[model samples]
Target: GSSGSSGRKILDSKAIDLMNALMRLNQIRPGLQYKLLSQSGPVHAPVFTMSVDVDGTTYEASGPSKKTAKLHVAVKVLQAMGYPTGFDADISGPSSG
Candidate 1:
């Protein structure tokens, strides 16, 4: 019998790092917010577009999941704010996985 379960790579540190950066920067003002702009595709395999508002400016990104979408959008916001987000794999890397 073929076993389907196997160890998988875990690299959410990038997302966590970006999220923390935003939280720290907006700790005092507490103006950070997230919004779901759109969700397309089939119910089983949906595409989500998430946005984050900072100082009235919104950053957006889409992904297969809401968490991924939010994390991606966070990267955009952090990069715009001069935060170094060296996540080439997440942002724009080789399309072949």
Candidate 2:
């Protein structure tokens, strides 16, 4: 079905990273929102919770850092949506390979 190549000889999933994708997606779509829902943990290890609104739903995940937290949410958003970055491709080769 959707597993085979869709006319591309080699699929490239690194065309866009989360930052660029999120910004562009939000600018056009107007629903990809990132909310810092919470941040709590021990003083030495603060945990951040982030929610990314996508496809009429919110995906929540926590991380030790805000950047990691945002990336975490972005992953869910991309999966719920779609992406060029923040994804894993099968039969992958080195970027310089």
Candidate 3:
């Protein structure tokens, strides 16, 4: 599946570790906030969605469903995905899924 492939290429243990470290840093810093949305399954067969925000900027990683996240982190989880600058993507849909 494309989703799984993308996840594998992008999301990995090292990525998770880095995200966790960023989260801890945010916790220590004042006025810094983060959030995570995740969906999980077996290893090599997992579902994930990560939504991270820092200083009002937000980034998200999502899969098929909107629930049962494998790993969700709030702290701009895009740099690791090769997004160097702040760009915008239009994402609009029904409020309920």
Compare the candidates by lDDT and give the number of the best one: 1
**Alpha-carbon lDDT of model 2:** 0.63
Ranking by lDDT: 1, 2, 3
Estimate candidate 3's alpha-carbon lDDT, on a 0 to 1 scale.
0.43
Q: Clashing pairs in model 1?
A: none
Predicted candidate 2 versus true structure: per-residue lDDT over 17-94, tens digit per residue? 545644554564663446788788897799989887666777887987776676666655665655554456554456
- The ten-residue window of minimal lDDT in model 1 covers 7-16
lDDT of candidate 3 at residue 65, scale 0 to 100: 35
Query: How many residue-pair clashes does candidate 2 contain?
Result: 0
RMSD of every prediction: 13.2, 14.5, 12.9
The total of clashing pairs for model 3 equals 10
TM-score to native of every candidate shown: 0.57, 0.52, 0.30
TM-score of 2: 0.52
Per-residue lDDT of candidate 3, residues 1-97 (tens digit) = 3234422123234442434544343454434432456567766666566565544556565544333232333323434444332334745566721
Which ranges of candidate 1 are over 4 A from the true structure? 1-31, 89-97
Best of the candidates, TM-score: 1
